[PDB]
Amino acid sequence: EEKEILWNEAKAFIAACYQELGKAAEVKDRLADIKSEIDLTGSYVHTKEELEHGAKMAWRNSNRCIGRLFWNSLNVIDRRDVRTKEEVRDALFHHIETATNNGKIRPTITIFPPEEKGEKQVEIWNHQLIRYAGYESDGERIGDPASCSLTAACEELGWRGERTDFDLLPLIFRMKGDEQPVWYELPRSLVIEVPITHPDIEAFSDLELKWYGVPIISDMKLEVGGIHYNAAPFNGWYMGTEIGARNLADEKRYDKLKKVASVIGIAADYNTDLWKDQALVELNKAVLHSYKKQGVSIVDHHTAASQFKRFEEQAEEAGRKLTGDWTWLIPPISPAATHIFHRSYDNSIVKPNYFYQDKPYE
Amino acid sequence: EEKEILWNEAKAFIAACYQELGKAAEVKDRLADIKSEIDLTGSYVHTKEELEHGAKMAWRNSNRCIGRLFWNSLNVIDRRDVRTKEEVRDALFHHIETATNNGKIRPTITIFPPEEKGEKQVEIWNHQLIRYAGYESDGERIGDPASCSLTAACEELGWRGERTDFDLLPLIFRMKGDEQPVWYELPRSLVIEVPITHPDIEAFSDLELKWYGVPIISDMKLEVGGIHYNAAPFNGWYMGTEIGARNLADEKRYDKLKKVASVIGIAADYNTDLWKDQALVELNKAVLHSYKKQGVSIVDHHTAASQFKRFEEQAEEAGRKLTGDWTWLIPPISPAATHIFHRSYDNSIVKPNYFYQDKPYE
Ligand code: HEM
Ligand code: HEM
Ligand SMILES: Nc1cccc(CNCc2cccc(OCc3ccc4ccc(N)nc4c3)c2)n1
Ligand SMILES: Nc1cccc(CNCc2cccc(OCc3ccc4ccc(N)nc4c3)c2)n1
Numbered sequence: 126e127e128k129e130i131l132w133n134e135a136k137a138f139i140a141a142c143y144q145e146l147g148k149a150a151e152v153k154d155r156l157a158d159i160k161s162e163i164d165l166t167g168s169y170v171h172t173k174e175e176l177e178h179g180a181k182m183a184w185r186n187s188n189r190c191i192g193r194l195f196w197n198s199l200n201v202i203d204r205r206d207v208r209t210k211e212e213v214r215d216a217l218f219h220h221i222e223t224a225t226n227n228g229k230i231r232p233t234i235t236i237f238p239p240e241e242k243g244e245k246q247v248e249i250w251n252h253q254l255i256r257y258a259g260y261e262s263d264g265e266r267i268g269d270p271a272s273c274s275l276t277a278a279c280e281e282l283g284w285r286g287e288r289t290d291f292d293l294l295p296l297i298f299r300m301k302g303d304e305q306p307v308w309y310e311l312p313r314s315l316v317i318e319v320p321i322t323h324p325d326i327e328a329f330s331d332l333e334l335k336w337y338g339v340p341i342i343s344d345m346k347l348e349v350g351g352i353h354y355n356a357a358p359f360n361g362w363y364m365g366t367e368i369g370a371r372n373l374a375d376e377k378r379y380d381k382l383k384k385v386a387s388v389i390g391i392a393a394d395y396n397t398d399l400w401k402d403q404a405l406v407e408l409n410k411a412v413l414h415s416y417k418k419q420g421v422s423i424v425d426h427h428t429a430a431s432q433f434k435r436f437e438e439q440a441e442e443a444g445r446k447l448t449g450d451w452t453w454l455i456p457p458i459s460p461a462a463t464h465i466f467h468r469s470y471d472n473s474i475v476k477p478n479y480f481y482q483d484k485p486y487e
Numbered sequence: 488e489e490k491e492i493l494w495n496e497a498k499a500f501i502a503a504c505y506q507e508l509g510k511a512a513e514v515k516d517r518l519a520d521i522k523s524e525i526d527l528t529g530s531y532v533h534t535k536e537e538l539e540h541g542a543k544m545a546w547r548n549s550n551r552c553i554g555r556l557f558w559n560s561l562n563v564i565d566r567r568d569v570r571t572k573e574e575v576r577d578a579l580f581h582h583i584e585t586a587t588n589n590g591k592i593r594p595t596i597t598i599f600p601p602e603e604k605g606e607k608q609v610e611i612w613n614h615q616l617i618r619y620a621g622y623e624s625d626g627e628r629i630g631d632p633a634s635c636s637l638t639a640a641c642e643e644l645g646w647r648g649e650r651t652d653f654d655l656l657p658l659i660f661r662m663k664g665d666e667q668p669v670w671y672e673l674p675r676s677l678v679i680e681v682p683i684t685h686p687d688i689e690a691f692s693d694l695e696l697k698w699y700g701v702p703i704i705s706d707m708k709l710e711v712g713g714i715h716y717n718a719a720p721f722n723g724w725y726m727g728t729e730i731g732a733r734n735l736a737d738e739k740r741y742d743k744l745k746k747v748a749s750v751i752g753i754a755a756d757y758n759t760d761l762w763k764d765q766a767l768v769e770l771n772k773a774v775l776h777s778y779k780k781q782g783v784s785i786v787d788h789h790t791a792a793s794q795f796k797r798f799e800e801q802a803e804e805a806g807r808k809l810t811g812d813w814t815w816l817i818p819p820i821s822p823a824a825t826h827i828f829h830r831s832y833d834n835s836i837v838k839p840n841y842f843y844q845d846k847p848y849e
């Protein structure tokens with residue numbers, strides 16, 4: 126009766142999907158062909174139209190995402206035809222290149238073959254396609270601590286990092302039938318990076334900070350109508366606070382706040398001086414300034430929250446129930462200066478959606 | 488069987504309360520006297536010891552409170568003996584004076600007679616004993632908009648505000664048997680106020696901002712062992728962000744951020760400049776600096792979060808389950824710079840506790 130889950134989800138997804146596309150008359154013929162298809166083969170195949178709209182629905186349903194205003198303009202690349210490692214690798218390369226778009230990031234998702242009967246066809250190990258290695262031994266911490274386990278796994282497979290603070294991890298993924306993943310160094314010409322400078326404080330460049338242009342989340346499962354697309358990397362553009370308030374500020378990541386305090390010329394001695402708060406603002410100002418100056422898409426949390434308010438209004442005008450996760454939608458800098466903080470949201474889980482899945486490493 | 492709720496709550500409260508006080512042998516005799524007392528009279532009376540510890544438990548159980556480390560040092564004033572308006576008024580005056588303590592705020596609660604059989608003995612109308620009036624007519628907004636309905640109610644009763652931005656509301660409460668509340672002007676010698684200056688920026692005084700020293704929450708119901716103390720005003724000291732990030736910053740309160748931006752010499756034109764963020768930090772620095780300089784107790788959100796971490800550790804060392812409301816415990820300035828943001832909390836409701844109750848006005 127594992128088959129029955131799939132028939133139930135397909136009924137719910139096709140009905141809602143064809144309704145939004147003005148194809149409601151076709152739902153009944155398409156469901157019959159679907160019902161025959163699972164009886165015979167155990168699964169069914171989405172049309173390009175269903176797959177595209179389902180990926181957009183999944184984004185629209187992501188309770189934790191503040192950028193959902195633009196769900197309908199998601200650029201869906203259908204790569205369910207890939208069978209080899211070189212095709213996986215080149216499709217990932219292509220995703221980076223087309224999503225990057227010389228700095229004007231296009232929200233893009235590349236969709237690989239789904240799980241057949243729980244068996245993955247392609248298993249991506251990267252958390253993001255572009256992200257820095259992290260090392261910790263002999264008391265020395267180098268790079269991004271969030272990447273330490275993946276970096277250790279990559280170096281079991283013959284890869285070796287330069288041990289800078291910004292080593293690019295290679296693409297790492299495993300094919301069905303293979304016992305071990307393969308890895309491929311990223312072509313540096315494809316990866317845009319942004320040096321972090323400050324608009325007013327020339328000494329900020331002494332910190333030698335940088336970040337990559339495009340966050341491409343590559344380890345979540347896209348679930349559309351009972352079909353599990355475990356390999357479906359997607360990207361938007363950064364909200365500035367993700368870099369300035371978390372990646373570069375967490376003690377547990379790059380932990381730069383105390384160095385930021387020094388170069389902006391304030392003491393880091395007393396809690397009552399709010400030096401962490403002041404450093405966070407100047408760092409976050411630097412990130413936004415630096416991405417703008419290089420021509421790489423980014424959004425500040427105020428503009429992002431205004432956009433999300435329009436998403437809330439678009440939802441009701443459309444008759445669609447709104448779902449959201451208050452604890453993730455508030456930004457980590459001045460959350461009470463956004464409207465999100467002052468209302469409530471139903472955190473109900475609606476499908477299609479993106480979901481966590483177990484890491485193939487530890 | 489309304490009586491049965493009360494017997495059940497008394498069993499749970501007395502058992503837990505006598506256990507913590509090392510009086511576990513006495514629980515059984517005390518419960519018998521209690522059980523006789525409700526059968527005969529319909530209710531029971533707490534000892535000073537039970538009332539004191541129950542008020543402390545209620546504070547320890549307040550999921551939304553970050554200052555719970557100090558729950559056991561709460562100063563409990565037992566005023567269940569009051570019968571007249573003058574005694575209510577003088578006990579409220581006394582609370583202000585003793586909680587203020589010339590600026591070294593003592594966390595204090597004054598406990599008035601409880602509800603008898605749903606009938607309140609004293610009904611306090613103030614949200615806080617000390618707070619500013621708010622006016623809005625003919626497009627003009629004056630004072631604190633949060634106080635507009637209460638201020639309108641006070642002026643129906645013969646009170647008239649000066650229409651400054653910082654009119655002190657009078658004490659306003661109703662006695663059992665009376666159709667209308669009485670009101671009493673606060674003696675200004677009892678109310679400490681703090682002018683807001685900035686440690687570095689002399690022009691900040693041009694804003695002419697101030698706040699009162701002691702927040703004394705006066706409209707919550709203390710529930711201890713089935714006894715409902717609807718009139719039980721309490722105070723701690725402010726966390727700085729309550730004044731700097733909410734009272735003075737909300738568009739919906741004093742809405743000062745745009746004026747703060749001007750006097751600290753930054754433009755308020757572009758979201759990407761993070762001018763709201765920068766103004767929030769300087770305003771919050773000014774509040775902490777001003778309270779310190781005057782000698783009025785206050786805590787910054789970093790120190791407060793460190794204290795709450797000790798509360799978490801004290802809880803487990805004591806074998807007590809910890810409850811908390813993540814959405815209220817994170818501070819509204821740099822929440823991700825505190826440990827609270829990076830963990831989860833069980834928001835379960837445990838009694839004794841403090842609860843909302845309907846306003847007697849609208
Ligand atoms: C267009 C620009 C986008 C922006 C600015 C944006 C912004 C964000 C932010 C700030 C978060 C929270 C991260 C944090 O709190 O640290 C988030 C979460 C999320 N976003 Fe978006 N997003 C965008 C596009 C997308 C796209 C294209 C998708 C997928 C198609 C997506 C799906 C999600 C999901 C699934 C989460 C939650 C992941 C998790 O629970 O860990 N977003 N988004
Ligand atoms: C000693 C200093 C204290 C500090 C610094 C403190 C801090 C706070 C803060 C910051 C809040 C949240 C307000 C907001 O998010 O805007 C809060 C909520 C609360 N505190 Fe405390 N607190 C203190 C003492 C007390 C005392 C003495 C009591 C009662 C005996 C108490 C009971 C509560 C309750 C019941 C709430 C939640 C009220 C609601 O839901 O609206 N606190 N506290
Ligand atoms: N807020 C909050 C609130 C509470 C806790 C956290 C944890 N916080 C760090 C974190 C951990 C894991 C994932 C993550 O993010 C994922 C993600 C997915 C898609 C995105 C698309 C665009 C974009 N710009 N970012 C995205 C981030 C964050 N965070
Ligand atoms: N965080 C958060 C998170 C979400 C929403 C809010 C709403 N926010 C404003 C607000 C409204 C009502 C009450 C309130 O506070 C009550 C209170 C009670 C006791 C205190 C004791 C000491 C102290 N220093 N403050 C206290 C405040 C806030 N807030």
Ligand SMILES: [Cl-]
Nearest residue numbers: 340367368372
């Ligand atoms: Cl990231």
Ligand SMILES: [Cl-]
Nearest residue numbers: 702729730734
């Ligand atoms: Cl307040």
